[PDB]
């Protein structure tokens, strides 16, 4: 899915992902490739990930309704 700012996912048509200007977001860090083993070729390979993440990496919502909660809010 979209790998950029989740805020632009629910934006109104004509402005979503339009790249008009900078968009604020929540801090997040991602780690998925720890260290390659640098092993050799194996037939059994032809025949888990456990990624590491931190912070807020999504868009939140208000409690009263389904209005998307901005990071500034």
């Amino acid at each position: 899915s979209y790998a950029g700012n989740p805020q632009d996912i629910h934006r109104q048509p004509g402005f979503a992902f339009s790249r008009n200007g900078p968009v604020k977001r929540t801090p997040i860090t991602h780690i998925l490739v720890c260290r390659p083993k640098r092993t050799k070729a194996s037939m059994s390979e032809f025949l888990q990930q456990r990624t590491y993440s931190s912070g807020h990496n999504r868009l939140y919502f208000h409690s009263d309704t389904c209005l998307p909660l901005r990071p500034q809010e």
């Binding site: 939140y60 919502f61 208000h62 409690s63 909660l69």
Partner: protein
Amino acid sequence: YLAVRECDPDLCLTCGAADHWDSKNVSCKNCSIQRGSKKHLLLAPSDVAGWGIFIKDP
């Protein structure tokens, strides 16, 4: 704590259940729910199913 109870403000006096009513969390840690102070929570689509509550602070 043995009786699984809070601290009555009129009985547990020096413990901290009565002093500084209009302030932040008191010294006694067995009075947070009585004061109504809790941690901020958020709402977002859950990574498992539906909505989920994500806490802002550790």
